[PDB]
Design an enzyme around this catalytic site. Structure first.
Site, mmCIF file in Angstrom:
data_model
loop_
_atom_site.group_PDB
_atom_site.id
_atom_site.type_symbol
_atom_site.label_atom_id
_atom_site.label_comp_id
_atom_site.label_asym_id
_atom_site.label_seq_id
_atom_site.Cartn_x
_atom_site.Cartn_y
_atom_site.Cartn_z
ATOM 1 N N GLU A 15 0.782 -1.157 -0.070
ATOM 2 C CA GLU A 15 0.007 -0.185 0.062
ATOM 3 C C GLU A 15 0.957 1.125 -0.018
ATOM 4 O O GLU A 15 0.605 2.264 0.663
ATOM 5 C CB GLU A 15 -0.886 0.229 1.227
ATOM 6 C CG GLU A 15 -1.668 -1.343 1.308
ATOM 7 C CD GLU A 15 -2.517 -1.459 2.866
ATOM 8 O OE1 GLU A 15 -3.363 -0.539 3.063
ATOM 9 O OE2 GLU A 15 -2.080 -2.382 3.490
ATOM 10 N N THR A 20 1.052 1.415 -8.611
ATOM 11 C CA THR A 20 0.382 2.872 -9.119
ATOM 12 C C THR A 20 1.747 3.628 -9.636
ATOM 13 O O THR A 20 1.245 4.301 -10.928
ATOM 14 C CB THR A 20 -0.068 3.819 -7.978
ATOM 15 O OG1 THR A 20 -1.210 3.506 -7.592
ATOM 16 C CG2 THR A 20 -0.025 5.299 -8.460
ATOM 17 N N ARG A 149 -7.324 -0.162 -6.667
ATOM 18 C CA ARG A 149 -6.416 -0.962 -5.462
ATOM 19 C C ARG A 149 -6.571 -2.543 -5.769
ATOM 20 O O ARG A 149 -7.610 -3.051 -5.214
ATOM 21 C CB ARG A 149 -6.874 -0.720 -4.186
ATOM 22 C CG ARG A 149 -6.487 -1.612 -3.138
ATOM 23 C CD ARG A 149 -5.094 -1.576 -3.218
ATOM 24 N NE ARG A 149 -4.288 -2.256 -1.989
ATOM 25 C CZ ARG A 149 -2.981 -2.424 -1.811
ATOM 26 N NH1 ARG A 149 -2.139 -1.901 -2.565
ATOM 27 N NH2 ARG A 149 -2.538 -3.255 -0.794
ATOM 28 N N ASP A 171 7.837 -5.269 -10.402
ATOM 29 C CA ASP A 171 6.802 -4.991 -9.530
ATOM 30 C C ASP A 171 6.693 -6.023 -8.280
ATOM 31 O O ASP A 171 6.054 -7.030 -8.796
ATOM 32 C CB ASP A 171 5.691 -4.792 -10.150
ATOM 33 C CG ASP A 171 4.338 -4.343 -9.364
ATOM 34 O OD1 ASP A 171 4.431 -3.776 -8.303
ATOM 35 O OD2 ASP A 171 3.059 -4.880 -9.744
ATOM 36 N N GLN A 175 3.356 -7.285 1.723
ATOM 37 C CA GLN A 175 3.008 -7.670 3.006
ATOM 38 C C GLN A 175 4.197 -8.595 3.242
ATOM 39 O O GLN A 175 4.712 -9.311 2.436
ATOM 40 C CB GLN A 175 1.612 -8.464 2.915
ATOM 41 C CG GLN A 175 0.520 -7.151 2.783
ATOM 42 C CD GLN A 175 0.327 -6.774 1.539
ATOM 43 O OE1 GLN A 175 0.972 -7.087 0.747
ATOM 44 N NE2 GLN A 175 -0.789 -5.684 1.674
HETATM 45 N N1 LIG Z 1 -4.216 9.960 -2.725
HETATM 46 C C1 LIG Z 1 -2.930 9.174 -3.064
HETATM 47 N N2 LIG Z 1 -3.296 7.675 -3.107
HETATM 48 C C2 LIG Z 1 -2.494 6.988 -3.441
HETATM 49 C C3 LIG Z 1 -1.167 7.578 -3.689
HETATM 50 N N3 LIG Z 1 -0.171 6.411 -4.059
HETATM 51 C C4 LIG Z 1 -1.101 5.342 -4.179
HETATM 52 N N4 LIG Z 1 -2.367 5.589 -3.782
HETATM 53 C C5 LIG Z 1 -3.423 4.686 -3.540
HETATM 54 O O1 LIG Z 1 -3.091 3.763 -2.707
HETATM 55 C C6 LIG Z 1 -3.169 2.307 -2.988
HETATM 56 C C7 LIG Z 1 -2.054 1.405 -3.046
HETATM 57 O O2 LIG Z 1 -1.357 1.696 -4.295
HETATM 58 P P1 LIG Z 1 -0.438 0.458 -4.875
HETATM 59 O O3 LIG Z 1 0.604 0.984 -6.151
HETATM 60 O O4 LIG Z 1 -1.272 -0.634 -5.474
HETATM 61 O O5 LIG Z 1 0.470 -0.233 -3.621
HETATM 62 P P2 LIG Z 1 1.472 -1.277 -3.593
HETATM 63 O O6 LIG Z 1 0.946 -2.500 -2.775
HETATM 64 O O7 LIG Z 1 2.577 -0.590 -3.034
HETATM 65 O O8 LIG Z 1 1.881 -1.758 -5.040
HETATM 66 C C8 LIG Z 1 -3.836 2.497 -4.458
HETATM 67 O O9 LIG Z 1 -5.546 2.446 -4.611
HETATM 68 C C9 LIG Z 1 -3.715 3.904 -4.793
HETATM 69 O O10 LIG Z 1 -4.921 4.452 -5.466
HETATM 70 C C10 LIG Z 1 -0.785 8.892 -3.487
HETATM 71 O O11 LIG Z 1 0.267 9.440 -3.574
HETATM 72 N N5 LIG Z 1 -2.007 9.491 -3.267
HETATM 73 F F1 ALF Z 2 -0.977 -4.240 -3.033
HETATM 74 AL AL1 ALF Z 2 0.926 -4.166 -2.480
HETATM 75 F F2 ALF Z 2 2.916 -4.214 -2.442
HETATM 76 F F3 ALF Z 2 0.635 -4.059 -0.791
HETATM 77 F F4 ALF Z 2 1.491 -4.425 -4.510
HETATM 78 MG MG LIG Z 3 0.698 -3.230 -6.075
#
Ligand SMILES: Nc1nc2c(ncn2[C@@H]2O[C@H](COP(=O)(O)OP(=O)(O)O)[C@@H](O)[C@H]2O)c(=O)[nH]1
Ligand code: ALF
Ligand SMILES: [Mg+2]
Lengths: 324, 177, 327
Positions: A15, A20, A149, A171, A175
């Site tokens: 998250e 993104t 998400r 990518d 968790q």
């Molecule tokens: N408002 C806002 N939302 C974000 C930002 N970055 C990510 N998100 C949101 O947080 C969630 C996590 O993004 P994601 O790239 O899937 O997380 P990951 O698990 O690290 O790959 C997504 O639903 C995005 O819409 C940001 O800079 N601002």
């Molecule tokens: F939804 Al993730 F790293 F927490 F891609």
């Molecule tokens: Mg992700």
């Protein structure tokens, strides 16, 4: 005997905006999102709304928050019964119920206290703008697609051709669950893009709820930077979700979670400056710079500028180091 | 008209000292140095203003494959050994020659016997007698030069400066042919 | 008549330390002739059409080396002149960085072939435009030499500085380490003739070791040279030298079972991957003392690698641990 390719790991707590980034790096250097490509995401926009609402609906019970308008007791039952993995239409037994629940000052009271349970970040963005989604002729805006998400459990690699040079952008999961797998894509790594969610400072981990979300992003960082296959690979720290911190820092104060921070309250900047400091100090090697950037991953034009500048550094390095 | 001289020999057999005496015209000032960075010197034999470049292989002696990087386009080799060490006369036909004539085929070799002054010195005679050896006489060095087939055998000493100039005068005129 | 020679240890050693420090300077500026003279001029004026596809192959990674020395290592040698006790700890510190000498050494034979054949009628020109006394092929040996002159300068500090303290232990490792770097560089020339392997040998971590083994599997007997890096182990056919690739196992999916059915000389290495099948190779050794050595070391590479993973899954816990190792 050409070698025009460059692997980059995206890493960090879940998250934090790893997926993104890949979406924006697609928007910018890939084929954009078409209308048919967007319509694929509607199912997931629809889903996220239930995820988020059910999340709070349960939070109400957990934290003994009372619903203000009795009629919402029904609404909250009906919605919590719904199977989110099968939901693929926003129709009106529910569309009205989720709208009513969002409107109850009780649910908002619960939402104002979101720190205390696992609710997503784009809940507001969607639940405020329900009427647009609930429209039968809905077609997700690129921003909606950027804010959805779909959590990653798998190392999916994304190449991007760019000025006769390929950057192979990995990518990974986020968790504790997934991090074993990471080591299988540690192979020919040129640079470690590490994401931290500036707004994590006040929350606890989804997987294990005793432990501060930055405390762990911090631990992970030093743990990776240490690892001895990454000594011949640059590290770039993207402190993400700045926009969220900027709004969050007005109510929830840093010093209560990190007392070492001796700066002022409600100061959007002073905070991130300090958060950055925490991380950059965990840099062990004193002969290596550890590049940083404050990002908002859902702001295409900010990300366009960041990766633009990041490349001209990454190229600059790997040219001198005879990898191109 | 530039030429390229590479030196070769065992450790502390007066490779680095020999080049300092020529490139300065002076003894090292009673601190024996270690690094002689590559020196183009202006020598003149038979009336030909040669600018002969000098390459030291100081230390690069326990590393088989790394020395070969110093050998290409070479026009002369000042292969040498210490007079005060018959163990340095042992490696001239054993380690050095066979290696040299592969990376520099038909390209000349000048054998040199360093520190001739330490032949006469009694402190280095009693030290050698312990090892059941003795200082290498000149009528052993000549026979070695013939055997391996050098351009010309010479002797000198870094302390005396004697035969130092005359060895390079040979190293220059050899670089012509 | 004793302590007046103990103080003679210092002065004599300061002359050796001050040589290093003052040679590290002339080396920096000699690399500065290469980097901001020949490469800067050639970038401004233009790249020759004969040498356009091979611009980089001449200068290797020399730009990376320069900027390290200039902006960090030199400056730390200056701190070592006014604090000579700090010197030994510094040469240990940066064992990993000196990897850049490996990439250069391996890419040196290529310079000669790209220089001595293509543009010698071109480097005459640049040599006379810049105006250096030293021709290009002289300045591009500096590091090759320099890296094998670090073993020497430190070895002379060990002679004279044995009397000025009994921390020959700090300088024991310091010298050891600074011989191994020229060992890798030397070894990584022979292993440069490894044909038919996709992936850069250089960036597969340290070449830990190598030896000859008989390689079964359920049978297909075969004498093979097994290289072992930190990230990978390669099986190769020797050509009596020069080698050929046959099989690999990345350390990321490596497994080991030693002393097979009793035998000291036999062990097995196993490759179990997320996407690939399951391979299993039985290595039988010559000297039992070579087999046992390998088990110990591979069983270790694993032990620590399975630490790392457990720490990924629990990172705060494992950095509480390491913070109390440090203190
Ligand atoms: N408002 C806002 N939302 C974000 C930002 N970055 C990510 N998100 C949101 O947080 C969630 C996590 O993004 P994601 O790239 O899937 O997380 P990951 O698990 O690290 O790959 C997504 O639903 C995005 O819409 C940001 O800079 N601002
Ligand atoms: F939804 Al993730 F790293 F927490 F891609
Ligand atoms: Mg992700």
């Amino acid at each position: 005997r050409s070698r025009r390719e460059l692997k980059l790991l995206l890493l960090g707590t879940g998250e934090s905006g790893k997926s993104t980034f890949i979406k924006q790096m697609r928007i910018i250097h890939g084929s954009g999102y078409s209308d048919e490509d967007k319509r694929g995401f509607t199912k997931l926009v629809y889903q996220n709304i239930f995820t988020a609402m059910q999340a709070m609906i349960r939070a109400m019970d957990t934290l003994k928050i009372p619903y203000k308008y009795e009629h919402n007791k029904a609404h909250a039952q009906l919605v919590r019964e719904v199977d989110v993995e099968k939901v693929s239409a926003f129709e009106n037994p529910y569309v009205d119920a989720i709208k009513s629940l969002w409107n109850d000052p009780g649910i908002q009271e619960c939402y104002d206290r979101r720190r205390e349970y696992q609710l997503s970040d784009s809940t507001k963005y969607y639940l405020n703008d329900l009427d647009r989604v609930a429209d039968p002729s809905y077609l997700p805006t690129q921003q909606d697609v950027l804010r959805v998400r779909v959590p990653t459990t798998g190392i999916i690699e994304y190449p991007f051709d760019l000025q006769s040079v390929i950057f192979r952008m990995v990518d990974v999961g986020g968790q504790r669950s997934e991090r074993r797998k990471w080591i299988h894509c540690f192979e020919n790594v040129t640079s470690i893009m590490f994401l931290v969610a500036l707004s994590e400072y006040d929350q606890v981990l989804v997987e294990s709820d005793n432990e501060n979300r930055m405390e762990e992003s911090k631990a992970l960082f030093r743990t990776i930077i240490t690892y001895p296959w990454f000594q011949n690979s640059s590290v770039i720290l993207f402190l993400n979700k700045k926009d969220l911190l900027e709004e969050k820092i007005m109510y929830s104060h840093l010093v209560d979670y990190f007392p070492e921070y001796d700066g002022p309250q409600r100061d959007a900047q002073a905070a991130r400056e300090f958060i950055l400091k925490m991380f950059v100090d965990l840099n062990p090697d004193s002969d290596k710079i550890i590049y940083s950037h404050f990002t908002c991953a859902t702001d295409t034009e900010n990300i366009r500028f960041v990766f633009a500048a990041v490349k001209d550094t990454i190229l600059q390095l790997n040219l001198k180091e005879y990898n191109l | 008209i530039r030429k390229k001289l590479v030196i070769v020999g065992d450790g502390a057999c007066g490779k680095t000292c020999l080049l300092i005496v020529f490139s300065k015209d002076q003894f090292p000032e009673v601190y024996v140095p270690t690094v002689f960075e590559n020196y183009v010197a202006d020598i003149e034999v038979d009336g030909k203003q040669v600018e002969l470049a000098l390459w030291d292989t100081a230390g690069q002696e326990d590393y088989d494959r790394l020395r070969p990087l110093s050998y290409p386009d070479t026009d002369v080799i000042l292969m040498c050994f210490s007079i005060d060490s018959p163990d340095s006369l042992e490696n001239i036909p054993e380690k050095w020659t066979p290696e040299v004539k592969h990376f520099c085929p038909n390209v000349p070799i000048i054998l040199v016997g360093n520190k001739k002054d330490l032949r006469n010195d009694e402190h280095t005679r009693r030290e050698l007698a312990k090892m059941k050896q003795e200082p290498v006489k000149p009528e052993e060095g000549r026979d070695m030069a013939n055997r391996i087939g050098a351009f010309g055998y010479m002797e000198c000493s870094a302390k005396t400066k004697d035969g130092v100039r005359e060895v390079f005068e040979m190293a220059t005129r050899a670089a012509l042919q | 008549s004793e302590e007046e020679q103990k103080k003679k240890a210092l002065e004599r050693s300061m002359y050796v330390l001050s040589e290093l420090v003052e040679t590290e300077k002339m080396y920096v500026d000699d690399l500065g002739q290469i980097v901001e003279g020949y490469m800067a001029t050639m970038a401004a004026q233009g790249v020759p059409e004969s040498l356009r596809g091979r611009d980089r192959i001449v200068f290797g990674n020399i730009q990376q080396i320069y900027e390290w020395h200039r902006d960090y290592f030199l400056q730390e040698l200056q701190r070592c002149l006014k604090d000579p006790d700090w010197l030994a700890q510094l040469f240990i510190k940066h064992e990993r960085r000196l990897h850049m000498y490996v990439v250069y050494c391996q890419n040196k034979p290529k310079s000669e072939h790209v220089v001595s054949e293509f543009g010698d009628s071109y480097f005459e020109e640049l040599r006379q435009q810049l105006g250096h006394r030293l021709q290009l092929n002289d300045l591009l040996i500096k590091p090759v030499q320099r890296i094998m002159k670090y073993q020497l300068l430190l070895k002379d500090f060990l002679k004279y500085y044995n009397r000025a303290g009994m921390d020959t232990a700090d300088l024991e490792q310091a010298v050891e380490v600074m011989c191994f770097v020229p060992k890798r560089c030397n070894d990584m020339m022979t292993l440069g003739r490894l044909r038919g392997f996709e992936g850069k040998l250089t960036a597969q971590g340290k070449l830990l070791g190598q030896d000859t083994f008989w390689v079964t599997e359920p049978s297909r007997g075969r004498e093979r040279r097994v290289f072992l890096f930190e990230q990978i182990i390669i099986f190769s056919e020797a050509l009596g030298p020069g080698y050929v690739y046959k099989n690999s196992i990345k350390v990321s999916c490596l497994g080991l079972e030693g002393n097979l059915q009793g035998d000291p000389c036999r062990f097995a290495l196993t490759s179990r991957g997320p996407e690939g099948g399951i391979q299993r190779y039985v290595l039988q050794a010559a000297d039992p003392a070579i087999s046992q050595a390998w088990i110990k070391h591979v069983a270790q590479i694993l032990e620590s690698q399975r630490d790392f993973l457990n720490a990924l899954q629990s990172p705060i816990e494992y950095q509480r641990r390491e913070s109390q190792t440090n203190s």
